[PDB]
């Protein structure tokens, strides 16, 4: 009855997308000049972690980053001099996400304890202490991103995202609609949108203010593990477990480009873009990152030197450096 | 080429390096045990015997060895996307009830709890992240199992059991049918124990199995293995 109505509605959506699409990105940008071979070297190695790193986030100052691992430590890194500004002893060792506030004042962490902890870096007493224990999730906190100094959008293992309010400790909007465990979210530059890929092989856009699911994107196969907006916020790339990164489209709603090779078979853990947006870096599971010409679907470089699986990969705001964490307790900065 | 503030920043980073090295060296002496199985499988009994949402942590000491238990009964999500966080586990404590062979599971009222535990053991043994790590198999509710096999035979679970209905060979058959699923026996050892009301033997079995795993790891370190 109504199931057939939903199926024919989805068929109408697919037919509308196929009617709207008339020329793919590869056909329309085939005449552009490729970047060619791109060589990056490990300028800095941020040693100091004594367990497997999961997530890192850069800073708006483009010099401080932060990274979380399984030793119950979250370290802020002075990436210019390879220094340790702070080291937070976490209460929960199992954390798959860490976030750096755009004001540089707070840091975040979360993982299998289902809690998005917030820490104050600029405390008057000097030491970094807890400010808010954001309880209210039952699944594992897979991603967290500071909307601003007072709000934070999180994706969890209970198939629901949550825009929080740090000044009250309770959510204001719950983003429901995924049929599967949402694994990563990315925040738009205009701060009023965010997309989140999930284990149902779909990435769903949401409005931060109201919570309506504006679009869904069902192009992948296995399950989404990586997501990142374009710098202009009109696209976003999704790395999943079928060894394919797919560029998407906020306006056209189709899949634009596919970034896959036959030599690579394992999935993607993290993705990030360059400032121009022409250089999408995807941290694969084959012990090395890849560099993809985001306009030609070609491979331009490999960021090797990791002896274990690359878990996190962040490109800094001024585009200078790409810090790539992995499971071998190291973060390597590329330039 | 460094200012005084940069020198003090470098010295602070060195002090943080020393503290992190001390913390990591303290944590590498810990033993990481992953708890798996249904919650009604004597998990409360084993945690209270070992002591006396998310993950409850149990830190207990027994003869100069530090233990950690990561019960994941409250993590009702997809295990495929977070089971790779437990690579460095000394053992996996896998509690499976014995008196669930004839009790029907509440989900769909068609499947049995014993065979669901068998499928759980299949998914835990045959996944990629647990290949060379041992599994401390526990079998639960021995007296309830005795009463239930006195009341009704084991053929109501499956009639493939050719033996007579006595506890010793019936439990031996269910242990063998649980252990022969292990695809690799050269690298992995399953340590089966029938849980008892005595609070010493239950933790002594875990101590012995973990010590055997530590012996194997030290052989791998020294290169003899």
């Amino acid at each position: 009855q109504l199931r057939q109505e939903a199926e024919q509605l989805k068929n109408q959506i697919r037919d509308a997308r196929k009617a709207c699409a008339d020329a793919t990105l590869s056909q329309i940008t085939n005449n552009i000049d490729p970047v060619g071979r791109i060589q990056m070297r490990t300028r800095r190695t941020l040693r100091g972690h004594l367990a497997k790193i999961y997530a890192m986030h850069w800073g708006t100052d483009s010099r401080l980053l932060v990274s979380a691992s399984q030793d119950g430590k979250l370290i802020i890194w002075d990436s210019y001099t390879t220094n340790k500004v702070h080291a937070i002893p976490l209460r929960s060792s199992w954390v798959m996400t860490c976030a750096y506030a755009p004001s540089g004042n707070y840091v975040a962490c979360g993982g299998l304890d289902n809690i998005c902890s917030i820490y104050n870096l600029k405390t008057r007493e000097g030491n970094v202490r807890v400010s808010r224990e954001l309880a209210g999730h039952t699944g594992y906190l897979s991603c967290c991103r500071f909307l601003d100094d007072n709000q934070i959008v999180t994706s969890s293992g209970d198939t629901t995202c949550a825009l929080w309010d740090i000044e009250t400790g309770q959510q204001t909007t719950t983003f429901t609609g995924h049929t599967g465990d949402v694994m990563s979210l990315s925040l738009a530059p205009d701060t009023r949108l965010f997309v989140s890929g999930a284990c149902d092989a779909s990435a769903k856009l949401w409005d931060v203010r109201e919570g309506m699911c504006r679009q869904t994107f069902t192009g992948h196969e296995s399950d989404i593990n990586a997501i990142c907006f374009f710098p202009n916020g009109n696209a976003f790339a999704t790395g999943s477990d079928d060894a394919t990164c797919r560029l998407f489209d906020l306006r056209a709603d189709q899949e634009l480009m596919t970034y896959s090779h036959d030599n690579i078979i394992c999935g993607i853990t993290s993705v990030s873009f360059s400032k121009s947006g022409r250089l999408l870096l995807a941290g694969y599971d084959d012990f090395n990152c890849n560099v993809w010409d985001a306009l030609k679907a070609d491979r331009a470089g490999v960021l090797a030197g990791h002896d274990n699986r690359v878990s996190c990969l962040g490109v800094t705001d001024d585009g200078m450096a790409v810090a790539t964490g992995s499971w071998d307790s190291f973060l390597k900065i590329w330039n | 080429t460094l200012s005084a503030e940069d020198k003090a920043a470098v010295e602070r980073s060195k002090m943080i390096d020393r503290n992190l090295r001390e913390d990591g060296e303290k944590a590498a002496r810990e033993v990481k045990l992953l708890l798996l199985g249904a919650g009604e499988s004597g998990k409360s009994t084993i945690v209270k015997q070992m002591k006396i949402t998310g993950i409850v942590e149990t830190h207990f000491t027994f003869k100069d060895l530090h233990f950690k238990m990561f019960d994941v009964g409250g993590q009702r999500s997809e295990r495929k996307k977070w089971i790779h966080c437990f690579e460095g586990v000394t053992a996996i404590i896998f509690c499976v009830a014995l008196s669930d062979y004839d009790l029907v599971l509440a989900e769909d009222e068609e499947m049995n709890r014993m065979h669901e535990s068998m499928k759980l053991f299949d998914s835990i043994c045959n996944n990629k992240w647990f290949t060379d790590t041992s599994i401390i198999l526990f079998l639960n509710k021995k007296d309830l199992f005795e009463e239930k096999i006195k009341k009704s035979p084991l053929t109501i679970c499956y009639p493939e059991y050719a033996g007579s209905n006595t506890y010793e060979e019936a439990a031996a058959y269910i242990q063998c049918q649980f252990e022969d699923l292990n695809k690799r026996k050269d690298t992995k050892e399953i340590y089966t124990h029938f849980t008892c009301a005595t609070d010493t033997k239950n933790v002594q079995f875990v101590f012995d199995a973990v010590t055997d795993v530590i012996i194997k790891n030290n052989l791998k370190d020294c290169g003899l293995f």
């Epitope: 540089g104 000097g126 | 200012s3 940069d6 020198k7 920043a9 010295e11």
Partner: single-chain antibody
């Protein structure tokens, strides 16, 4: 944050006196510590410094080997044991909180102070003016000169502005030539270039009355300016 000192009073010359700044209300072990003197009529002069974890200790050249500075991290206590007190030891001492990482604000808390009166190649900082007659409501520029460029190769100009209101301890206004300390109103603003230090105070009020000190931190020993006293 609260740092209170003890162990003052009149001392016989050639004698000894134990100073103790019992820090409380903050994580003492993560903060480097200082002692900063002040003559009964003149400005400030730096005395000694101990790093967090006692890694590096620096002394003023006038008291190098005469003063010993130590810390007791479990007790959150600072110390300054003094021997053979001379004629220029009649002054008063401040225990200064400081911290050094990227984006830190060192020299930002100061103790209340204790008084000790005796009985009968450095970058010299010179405040060009000494006093300015200023009514509340107009912008004032405080000029301090330097004998060396404080702009290091990393891009930081290490200049530290202080405000010592009459009857109380100095406090930070500008750290590293451009950045306002915590609790400092936005009307304060330091700007300039090498060896040219101007502190502009738009919309002056009655709380700006006091002596303004320029300090260098590019190297050691730390040297203060003469000080510009502002009165209405």
């Amino acid at each position: 944050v609260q740092l209170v000192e003890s162990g003052g009073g009149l001392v016989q010359p050639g004698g000894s006196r134990k100073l103790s700044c019992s820090a409380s209300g903050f994580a003492f072990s993560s903060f480097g510590m200082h002692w900063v003197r002040q003559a009964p009529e003149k400005g400030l002069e730096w005395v000694a410094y101990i790093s967090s974890g006692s890694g590096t200790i620096y002394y003023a050249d006038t008291v190098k080997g005469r003063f010993t500075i130590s810390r007791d991290d479990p007790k959150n206590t600072l110390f300054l044991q003094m021997t053979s007190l001379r004629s220029e030891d009649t002054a008063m001492y401040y225990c200064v909180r400081s911290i050094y990482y990227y984006g830190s604000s060192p020299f930002d808390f100061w103790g209340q102070g204790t008084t000790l009166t005796v009985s009968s190649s450095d970058i010299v900082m010179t405040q060009a003016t000494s006093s300015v007659p200023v009514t509340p409501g107009e912008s004032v520029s405080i000029s301090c000169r330097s004998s060396k460029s404080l702009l290091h190769s990393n891009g930081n100009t290490y200049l530290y502005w202080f405000l010592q209101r009459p009857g109380q301890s100095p406090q930070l206004l500008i750290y590293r030539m451009s950045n306002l300390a915590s609790g400092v109103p936005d009307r304060f603003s330091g700007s300039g270039s090498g060896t040219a230090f101007t502190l502009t105070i738009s919309r002056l009020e009655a709380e700006d009355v006091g002596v303004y000190y320029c300090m260098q931190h590019l190297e050691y020993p730390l040297t203060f300016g003469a000080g510009t006293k502002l009165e209405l």
